[PDB]
């Protein structure tokens, strides 16, 4: 890798600078370099990894949706399909890169619940982004891979974390989105969002003001989805 000659601490510092500069491709390359040093990531470092790749793939997904819409309207020369395919392939490449980092070897080395759930949630998310653009038999397998990662993360989170833990909440949020938008299971999505919200509500009394703010921010998204879905 092009980051092999840079110190781990320098890569982390530069990832933080890239975030401030809104240079998310750079941020992702720095964090990939940090992961490839082979040491586990701290909580802050895991969040930098996630912020970098969520912003990169988020831009790709937005572009893919614009192009897909144009292509479908044109289906009501080859250039629109070719360019949508170009963006799609780049998106798939970024998802494959993230999944490869998780497989080599972030998940296998993650023994604490907070790290393992975080990485399995990431694995679910990036398979979900692959599913958004997949067509056919490969779509079924990609969907099952997302479901399997989310389910393992859910099982650990329910045994090891309180219902208000922000990682647990964000996992349940994204799994509910998977059910509604990917798996054609809107009732499962609604049930998961409702149960997650209610169990978090009942645990808010245990939280400090700052943790209360962190948890309620994600609970609001569960409510926002329930309002869209019901």
């Amino acid at each position: 890798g092009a980051m092999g000659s840079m110190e781990r601490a320098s890569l982390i510092q530069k990832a933080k600078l890239a975030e401030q500069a809104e240079r998310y491709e750079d941020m992702a390359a720095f964090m990939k370099g940090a992961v490839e040093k082979g040491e586990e990531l701290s909580c802050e470092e895991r969040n930098l990894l996630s912020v970098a790749y969520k912003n990169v793939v988020g831009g790709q997904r937005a572009a893919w949706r614009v192009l897909s819409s144009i292509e479908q309207k044109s289906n009501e020369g080859p250039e629109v399909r070719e360019y949508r395919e170009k963006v799609e392939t780049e998106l798939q490449g970024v998802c494959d890169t993230v999944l490869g980092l998780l497989d080599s070897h972030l998940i296998k080395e993650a023994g604490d619940a907070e790290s393992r759930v975080f990485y399995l949630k990431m694995k679910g998310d990036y398979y979900r982004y692959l599913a958004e653009v997949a067509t056919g038999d490969d779509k079924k397998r990609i969907i099952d891979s997302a479901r399997s990662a989310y389910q393992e993360a859910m099982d650990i989170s329910k045994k090891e974390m309180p219902p208000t833990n922000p990682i647990r909440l964000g996992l349940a949020l994204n799994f509910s989105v998977f059910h509604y938008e990917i798996a054609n299971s809107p009732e499962e999505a609604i049930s998961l969002a409702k149960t997650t919200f209610d169990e978090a509500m009942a645990d808010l009394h245990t939280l400090s003001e700052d943790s209360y703010k962190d948890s309620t921010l994600i609970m609001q998204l569960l409510r926002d989805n329930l309002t869209l879905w019901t």
């Binding site: 969040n47 912020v51 988020g58 964000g170 949020l173 989105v177 509604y180 999505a189 998204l221 869209l228």
Partner: peptide
């Protein structure tokens, strides 16, 4: 579309 966890 639905709301997923914010990018950060």
């Amino acid at each position: 579309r639905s709301f997923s966890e914010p990018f950060g």
